[PDB]
């Protein structure tokens with residue numbers, strides 16, 4: 588008697604790379620759980636939904652999931668699309684574990700049926716600021732964001748921390764996502780002789796900004812959130828992605844204990860290096876731990892906040908809001924290689 592689990596993320600669109608990572612992680616974890624017998628004999632069955640990381644299409648997905656009788660949702664990914672979906676799931680008694688949404692607002696609303704297998708930007712932001720103040724110490728900072736929930740929230744958090752350190756923030760600018768042309772911004776960085784730029788947003792925009800900055804002879808150092816730390820950034824920017832600083836989950840694919848999963852994934856020619864392969868795999872293991880105790884959303888949610896669950900990410904424990912206790916983002920150097928190393 589299969590147990591339906593909706594996996595929802597961007598499978599198409601501008602940031603389909605987030606979904607490629609999520610589905611790869613969900614697929615392998617379900618393959619592993621089922622291989623050992625699943626949940627007390629019952630196998631997990633993945634039902635795939637594409638919300639294109641679009642708020643309107645995510646609601647349409649939420650309504651279909653509620654309608655299809657599915658009780659557990661592993662997703663969505665982007666915060667502004669997860670928000671509206673989340674509310675429909677909460678009002679409807681459907682558990683929702685998100686492996687990528689980081690805006691604080693998600694777990695700040697009293698929801699009793701939401702959990703994350705990733706951290707909060709209330710931590711990610713501060714970490715970038717601290718690192719800039721203590722290790723980079725630039726002289727002329729500019730901050731750019733895409734006017735979206737995730738990017739602006741992070742951009743304002745970083746501005747905040749830099750001010751507390753009395754750093755020199757020359758300007759705070761918001762750009763429109765989807766635009767491929769940034770000559771104006773670039774010409775401005777050159778003009779203001781900006782030596783450091785924190786960018787709050789996704790890889791599509793970061794990739795264009797980076798290419799256009801190097802093409803104009805700028806050596807400006809850039810830094811972005813985990814949202815820009817992925818192979819699609821390197822695809823778009825080419826060598827211009829080299830040198831980029833990023834905050835992002837720890838390299839779980841490097842944990843020696845995890846090598847069997849890395850191998851199984853590589854054997855299907857899929858990419859196991861993305862952070863979301865692991866948070867999603869972890870989300871599936873949390874749901875497994877839950878389904879072993881009960882099939883009822885509230886019961887599962889209760890049980891998770893009550894226990895420490897061992898996962899590919901290490902032991903996980905959640906607060907009453909459904910956030911990971913003690914989660915920490917590291918700062919890394921990103922390489923055109925699709926590789927990432929500990930930052931100085």
Ligand SMILES: CC(C)[C@H](N)C(=O)O
Nearest residue numbers: 665666687688689814
């Ligand atoms: C990268 C993406 C999933 C981002 N963390 C967000 O909350 O939108």
